[PDB]
Every structure is written in structure tokens, then in C-alpha cells.
Amino acid sequence: YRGKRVSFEFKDIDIQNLLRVIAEISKKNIVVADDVSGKVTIRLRNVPWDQALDLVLRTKALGKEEFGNIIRIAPDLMVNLLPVNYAVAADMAARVKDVLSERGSVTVDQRTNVLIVKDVRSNTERARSLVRSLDTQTPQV
């Protein structure tokens, strides 16, 4: 769960293809089962892959299990990184969980106090507006 930064753009492609593509970029050797799912659409910018993966799982796709050398996977939206300069990322977690409800979309907390969201643009926009708005009362030091 650490990698080079990437931009994932997938317009109506088999998750098996996204997976292989992700193995062809040295993001492990990835192998699915045979019939995992189908086709998905995502479009990410500035996301390390191992995350864009965790995030792909949550879209439609699978869960991942690693053997070590190989990993087995079994059965636009966009991603944007939000810097949080002023507040701690965990203090947002209550409010951010509360927008999601039983929706799709997710939020991932990276160690360097940045939030990452996959979702529809409309749920991304909401999550950014709240994260920045709460960040903004934290900049008045």
C-alpha cells in the first residue's frame, strides 16, 4: 500500500483489463479469478495506484488478497486529493461519514493528512466544499 502517483482514466473497460494494466505498470503482478464482475468507468488524477485500486474495489469491483509476488482478486467519477493544511484529517471523519450515508463514494485518509475521495463529481464537490470550509476556520490562527 504505497506506489508511484498516477492518473487513472477508464472509459467503459473490463476491471480485468484495468487490473492487467495495473500489473503492467509494476503494481504487483495482479491476477483475477476468471469471472469477477464486468466493465467499469472511473477517472482519477494525481492518485497513487495502490489507492486508486482500493478505490476501484469500492466502485463495483472486487476485494484484493496478496500472496506476495502475485495478488489474487476475487468476486465520470473522479478522484481528487484534498490537502488539509490546517486541521487533522480525522476531525473531518464525522461530517464526511454523515454526507455519504448509504451512498457511493468513499473517503480515504492518507498518512500525510490528505483526504482522497472517489465518487461521482456531485458527491466529490460536496465533500470538497465541506473539507475546505472546515479547513478555512482552521487557517485563522
Partner: protein, 101 residues
Amino acid sequence: DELGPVNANPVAACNEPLCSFDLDQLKLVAVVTGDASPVAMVEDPAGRGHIVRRNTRMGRQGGKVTQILRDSVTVTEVFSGNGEIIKNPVTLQLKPDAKQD
């Protein structure tokens, strides 16, 4: 005497597929980039997805992958220009709405 030897050899491989189809029939779906080097993803006129990267090939003209952007993919293809075999430096864009004859 041939059925009773109940024998099937299933299809799961590449057919060697895209070298049997023409390059302007193929449509760029997506691109992946990370530590494992950049790789393009492309769609057949038969609706299959493929994954190809710099130094690999696709299409009947043997279109060699030479560049990979986020929006587009430069390849070097093999056309018979007036009887000479020449290089054709095509760039396959991503798939939006489009129409031609």
C-alpha cells in the same frame, strides 16, 4: 469412436486477435500509468478490451506503440504508400462522440 473420447480444448487465449483487425477500427478506452510503466487500453470493433504499452504492437499494419498520453496514444504503423512500405505515425485519441464514413 471420436465423440466417446469426449474431448474439448477451450478458448481463453488471444486469437492472435488485433493483428487480424485494422488500426482505424480500434478505439482508445483508457490509459493506466504507475511504477510498472505506462500502458494504454484499447477496444476492438468486436468490443473486446486490450492492454498494450511502449514497444508492443496492435493491428494488421503492426502499429507499434511509441508514445502514451492521457488523452491519446502515438503509434508507428506500416502502410503501402503508392507501392512502398512506409511508416505511418498515427495518434489514437480517447473515445468521445464522433462520426465518419
